[PDB]
């Protein structure tokens, strides 16, 4: 019939006094069963612990025993309450976690964190109102938001951005979060929160120079390198991967999209086009892609790649032979000698015409006029068809005439013949 | 000052009939010269003198052998030589007429510009071609229409030859969730006595960026069910929306499996937001389930929204 109630603190030395049952004169007392935790003094009815009890280790902190008497037996039901100490701290599921905000997230964007638990009874358990940022928030970019579940079961913690995150200034934060329990000596737990700031494509590529400049000889072979451009992009990953391109796609140059090297793809020709002022673009691989631009001035350098040519001009122009009457006075123009060389005066040097046989009798002469590249072929002496009816004059023309040995420019040359019949 | 070597500068308008008069070589001789019997003509190969000009080698009169195009060739030079060896160096300059109006490659151009593009971003526009020279070529531009002036301005900076090339410059804020289409008109003109002109329509459309996150229509949802509720049956439907377009605004749903409490028996339809029961409940093991449901869009780096869901489970009897 009778029932008594004792309490004992956990974590106490073996042999701690639990309680003493209310005895009756002339009885002794034993436990009805052997108990792992307790033992009874049979003459006093005092109950003692046999080991150090861990309340967190028990299936139940209420234990039910039955004390039995000697003599004519009666039973005594005992209830032992194992009382809790605040000997566990609040703990997080992981000592450290990682969370991510996008740079240029709006003020008030949040991301969820972990909450703590505590293995003591609820009155020594986590105070879910106490979560606090204690280190790492020097810049004042963050605050905590706590949500206590209205049903009384548990809580949720969130980290809230106050806006103004810029990955290119601060890509990483490390916050320390402290939570308290509610126990006699207050205990604390801690969570390290690593904050990654995720990159957006907010920076465009930028060329190292806004004006490039290259010089290229017109005989540069295909595949040869012309000018290397390079841009930088202050973002990360794909957002800063740059592809280069020329704006005008109809030139004889070529831009490798990944290296920014401009090479020659089609043969150049100074005589056709001396210089190309081109716009180069650099484009990142972000979505919203962004673009930078620069200017590139490629001047071609003239090469001596054209022979000088001599043409004769004379009065049956539809014929391949000139004619001169035997009666023509000394000084009569018989033909013009015009030189054409498509290169520029730099690559050409001096151009000179020289007579290569045919005029052994000195009946004609070749005379430079006062106009560049035109000579006159005149009658120099009396003629008569009976002695000589025809002549064949051969002239050679040459650019870079009189150049010293070891000069950088090789001279080019051609020959031309003019035959002259005498009429009467 | 040397009678033996003179020069003559002649001029002729392009696009005149073949046979048109240009000038007379004898005008370049010293005054009082006996008219020569004939002239020798020297021109360099490639000069076009033989094909485009008709020179009377007896009289010295120069005409056009054909209709001359300044845009093709603007200058001829040759030397005339008398039979006794005096020279006249003559140049003919072909005068430019305004036989070309400015011309855009398209009457309707379409430009895509991302919403919220940074102030001062420049978009080069196709020029109006005009083959004529100097003031006769394209001189300027004018932009009209909605946003012209406040949201977009037109600017020209000379490229090669000083040919002005136009660029459209972002000067105001662009928001695709306010106004996503701009109809602009671009005008061009050369510098004739009455300028010749071209018009082109420019359709600017804003590309959507992922600047909204999904938002639930309640911050917390509640459902109340019997612990006898059969698996496979619905429990509750949540709803989030996203103001962007396309993938950026395409919302899907999941349950957060780390921070939820009482997580296992439930799943949610990734596209409809319907939470359903997957395994039987048990009032005596858990009376209340606290879940967090999440919405993500389809953006390149998805943006996220979440809401609380409290499920109250009632005992059978
Ligand atoms: C006026 O003189 C010209 C200059 O000749 C030089 O000077 C004379 C005085 C003399 O010293 C010659 O020995 C000099 O070369 C003459 O023009 C030259 O003619 C020669 C002969 O044909 C030309 O040579 C050939 O050129 C051809 C075209 O370029 C080549 O195909 C050829 O090479 C191959 O082919 C032949 C046949 O298949 C073979 O015999 C060769 O061995 C080789 O396999 C020759 O190289 C030379 O190019 C000419 N030089 C100039 C500056 O033009 C000219 O002769 C007239 O024209 C030539 C083309 C022939 O039709 C002659 O019969 C013709 O007379 C002189 N004019 C006269 C004499 O009226
Ligand atoms: C949270 O961050 C810490 C510290 O990260 C360091 O600093 C960063 C700015 C970056 O430069 C990292 O590379 C650095 O390691 C992490 O602590 C490190 O963890 C690794 C592996 O766990 C360990 O080898 C190192 O010794 C730790 N460094 C220090 C200083 O303790 C921690 O792991 C991060 N948490 C998570 C969940 O990733
Ligand atoms: C049960 O408790 C009694 C009382 O303490 C123990 O009996 C004796 O008690 C006196 C003082 O009351 C001590 O001076 C003696 O030393 C105790 N005897 C012994 C043998 O220790 C009794 O021993 C206890 N029973 C057990 C099993 O320990
Ligand atoms: C959130 O959205 C749902 C779905 O639209 C709403 O549920 C509706 O609620 C109205 C009354 O508010 C009822 O008339 C409808 O029958 C409900 N279902 C549907 C499919 O519309 C819910 O009310 C919304 N929550 C809030 C706070 O407005
Ligand atoms: C949308 O843009 C117009 C101007 O085009 C502006 O007047 C209006 O305030 C904007 N709407 C909102 C909701 O901001
Ligand atoms: C008259 As202009 C366009 O060549 O400066
Ligand atoms: C896992 As099922 C078929 O109950 O939705
Ligand atoms: C449910 As909420 C508005 O705290 O993300
Ligand atoms: Ca303990
Ligand atoms: Ca304890
Ligand atoms: Ca505790
Ligand atoms: Ca986490
Ligand atoms: Ca930034
Ligand atoms: Ca960035
Ligand atoms: Ca970038
Ligand atoms: Ca970087
Ligand atoms: Ca060349
Ligand atoms: Ca050359
Ligand atoms: Ca040459
Ligand atoms: Ca002279
Ligand atoms: Ca024309
Ligand atoms: Ca024009
Ligand atoms: Ca013209
Ligand atoms: Ca927007
Ligand atoms: Ca958007
Ligand atoms: Ca979105
Ligand atoms: Ca039940």
Residue numbers in the entry:
A (entry chain B): 44 to 467
B (entry chain A): 40 to 356
The publication says:
The Fat4(EC4):Dchs1(EC1) interface contains a hydrophobic cluster centered on Leu379 of Fat4(EC4) and Val120 of Dchs1(EC1). Within this cluster, Fat4 contributes a majority of hydrophobic residues including Val376, Leu417, and Leu419, which contact the methyl groups of Thr118 and Thr126 of Dchs1. On the Dchs1 side, the main contacts are formed by the sidechain of Phe79 and the main chain of β-strand 3. Additional backbone hydrogen bonding interactions can be seen flanking the hydrophobic cluster between the amine of Val376 and the carbonyl of Pro122, between Thr383 and the amine of Glu84, from the epsilon nitrogen of Arg356 to the carbonyl of I80, and from Gln83 to the carbonyl of Val382. The EC2:EC3 interfaces are largely hydrophilic and are formed between the β6 and β7 strands of the respective EC3 domains. A small hydrophobic core can be found in the Fat4(EC2):Dchs1(EC3) interface containing anchors Fat4-Phe199 and Dchs1-Phe347, in addition to Fat4-Ile155 and Dchs1-Val331. Extensive hydrogen bond networks can be found centered around Arg297 in the β3–β4 loop of Dchs1(EC3) and Asn152 located in the β4–β5 loop of Fat4(EC2). By contrast the Fat4(EC3):Dchs1(EC2) interface is devoid of any close contacts. The alignment of EC2–EC3 of each protein revealed that the EC1 of Dchs1 is tilted by ~35° towards Fat4, making it the only protomer that adopts such a pronounced curvature in a protocadherin-like binding interface. This distinctive conformation was observed in both the high- and low-resolution structures.
The atypical cadherins Fat and Dachsous are key regulators of cell growth and animal development. In contrast to classical cadherins, which form homophilic interactions to segregate cells, Fat and Dachsous cadherins form heterophilic interactions to induce cell polarity within tissues. Here, we determine the co-crystal structure of the human homologs Fat4 and Dachsous1 (Dchs1) to establish the molecular basis for Fat-Dachsous interactions. Fat4 and Dchs1 are two of the largest members of the cadherin superfamily and contain 34 and 27 extracellular cadherin (EC) domains, respectively.
